[PDB]
Amino acid sequence: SEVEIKFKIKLEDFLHTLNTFNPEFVRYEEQEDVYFEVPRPKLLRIRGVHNLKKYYLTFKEILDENNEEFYEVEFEIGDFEKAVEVFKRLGFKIQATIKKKRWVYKLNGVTLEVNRVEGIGDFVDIEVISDSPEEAKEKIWEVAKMLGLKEEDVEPRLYLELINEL
């Protein structure tokens, strides 16, 4: 039960704003995400993290039209390419491939995921893992307003949707 809101940013401006509140740095990932076509509201992707030599298989159910609410199951895998192969051979089509750099920062009960996404742009995802969407969204909006972010900065589309449109 992830609650999440995504904001368009200019990474440069935003890293000043962020250093001002100087949050805890968690981790850095150079990610390659391969999405496979599945009926909505499902998502299926294999992620490779080049810099860490880690790989993941992720399944999500999108739980609302906003794309702010997700059920997720994920686990590590030993081999990126073999997983992609298996799914191809199972007759799944590759819907999109997405490259991005991501810095994860933490505050009290909130995660900030600063994303630089090849061919699309820069975004911050403000996330809370909660069993209560309303309270979660309030925390996220408090953080966003603290960082000078507006409703007009909200990106409602999935990166998958943005790459396909782009």
Nearest to 34 by CA among 22, 45, 42, 24: 45
- Choose which of 19, 53, 73, 108 interacts with a copy of itself (CB under 8 A): 73
**Residue labelled with tokens 């799944």:** 92
User: Which range of residues in 77-85, 97-105, 111-119, 128-136 is near a copy of itself by CB under 8 A?
Assistant: 77-85
The values of phi and psi at residue 90, to 5°, are -75, 5
- Choose which of 61, 146, 151, 161 interacts with Pt ion (CB under 5 A): 146
The item of a copy of itself, Pt ion, none sharing an interface with residue 76, based on CB under 5 to 8 Å by kind, is a copy of itself
The item of a copy of itself, Pt ion, none sharing an interface with residue 146, based on CB under 5 to 8 Å by kind, is Pt ion
**How far is 15 from 86, CA to CA, in rounded Å?**
40
State the SS3 of 68-116.
CEEEEEEEEECCHHHHHHHHHHCCCCEEEEEEEEEEEEEECCEEEEEEE
- Choose which of 86, 104, 154, 158 interacts with a copy of itself (CB under 8 A): 86
78 binds a copy of itself (CB under 8 A): yes
Residue 54 vs 99, nearer CB to a copy of itself: 54
Quickly count: other Cβ atoms within 10 Å of residue 136's Cβ.
Answer: 23
Chain residues that interact with a copy of itself, rule: CB under 8 A: 38, 42, 44, 57, 59, 61, 73-79, 82-83, 85-86, 89-90
